[PDB]
Symmetry: D2
Subunit: 115 residues, 4 copies
C-alpha cells in the first residue's frame, strides 16, 4: 500500500469518517486523470487506493471532499475541498501517508513518507 490517506476532525476530536477522497494523476497534456478513489473508514483512513506497480513517479492530486463532510454534520464550511498536490519519487521512502486535519475554515496537511 504505497499511498494512504488519514483524515481527522478538529471540531469533534475524532476521525473524519465517510469522507470522499479522489486521487488524480497528471497526464502528459497537463490534465488531471482519475486514478483512485474511496471513502474514509471509521478510523478516518483510506487504504487500498493503489498498488506499487501502478503508483509510478509523477505528480498526483489528492482531493478530499471536505465541503460535503461538513454539510453532512450541519456545519457551513469555507472550502470546496482540500487538495494535496505532490510528486511521487522513487528515491524517497516507499510509503506515502497524506494526513489532513479539518476545521470548517481551515486545514492542515502533512506527508509522512516511510519505509
Amino acid at each position: 500500500c504505497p499511498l494512504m490517506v488519514k483524515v481527522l476532525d478538529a471540531v469533534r476530536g475524532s476521525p473524519a469518517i465517510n469522507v470522499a477522497v479522489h486521487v488524480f494523476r497528471k497526464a502528459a497534456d497537463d490534465t488531471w486523470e482519475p486514478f483512485a478513489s474511496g471513502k474514509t473508514s471509521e478510523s478516518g483512513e483510506l487504504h487500498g487506493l493503489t498498488t506499487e506497480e501502478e503508483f509510478v513517479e509523477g505528480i498526483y492530486k489528492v482531493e478530499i471532499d471536505t465541503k460535503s463532510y461538513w454539510k453532512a454534520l450541519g456545519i457551513s464550511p469555507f472550502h470546496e475541498h482540500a487538495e494535496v498536490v505532490f510528486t511521487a519519487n522513487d528515491s524517497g521512502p516507499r510509503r506515502y501517508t497524506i494526513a489532513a486535519l479539518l476545521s470548517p475554515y481551515s486545514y492542515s496537511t502533512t506527508a509522512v513518507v516511510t519505509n
Copy 2:
C-alpha cells in the same frame, strides 16, 4: 482590498517572502481561468490582487507556489503548491484573507472572512 494572502515560514519563524501566488476563477465552461497573481512582500503579505468590482461571485482557487518558494531557498519540499479553493461572495461582498503556514512536508491554511 477584498482578497489578501499572508504566508509564514514555520522553519525560520518569519514571513515567507517572495512567494508566488496565482488565483484562478472557475468559468462558465468549468475550467480554471487565470484571475490575478502576485508575490508576497517582506512582510509575507500580498495585497492588490483584485478589486471589489472585479471580485464577483464565483469559485476561486488560490495557488500558493510553495515548491517554487522552497526551491529558491535551495530545499526539496514535498508539495507542488498549496491550493485553496472556495466559493466567494455568494452572500454579498466579503473580504477574504487566506493565510498559510509552510513547512517542507506540511502546510496549514485558514481563511478569515469579514463583512465590511
Copy 3:
C-alpha cells in the same frame, strides 16, 4: 511592542475575540512568575503586554485561555489552554509575535521573530 499575540478561530473564520492571555517568566528559583496579561481585541490581537526594558532575557510561557474562550461561546473544548514556552532575547532584543489558530480539539501555534 516586543511581544504580541494573534489568535484566529478556525470554526468561524474570524479573529478570536476577547481571548485571555497570561504570560509568565521563569524566576531564579524555577517557578513561573506572573509577567503580563491581557485579552485579544476585535482583531484577535493583543498588544501592549510589555516593554523593551521589562522584557529581558528569560524563559517565558504564554498561556492562551482557549477553554475560557470556548466556554464563553457555550462550547465544550478539549484543552485547558494553549501554552507557548520559549527562551526570549538570548541573542539580544527581538520582537515576538505568537500566533495561534484554534479549533475545539486542536490548535496550531507559530512564532514570528524579528530583529528591529
Copy 4:
C-alpha cells in the same frame, strides 16, 4: 491503552523518533505530579503510558521535549517544549490520542478521542 501520543516531523516528513514525552497529573495543591513518561518509537508513537485503572478523571499535561529533538537534528528551534493540557473525562470516548506535528518555529496538536 487509554492514552497514546503520536509525534510527526513536518520538516522531514517522517515520524518524530526518540522524542521524550512526560505526562503529569495536576494534584490537589495545583502542582504537576509526574505520572508517566517515555520516548517515541520508530513510528513516532508512544504507547503503554498508563492503564485504564490509573487514568482517572483529572487534568493532565503532556510535555513533548521538542527542543532536544530539533537540536539532535542540528536545527535551532523556538520552543522549549510543546505542552498539551487537558481534562480526562469519563463521559467521553475511552481512548485519547494526542497527536503533534512539529516544525522548528511552530506546532499543531489535536486530540483524537475514540471508542
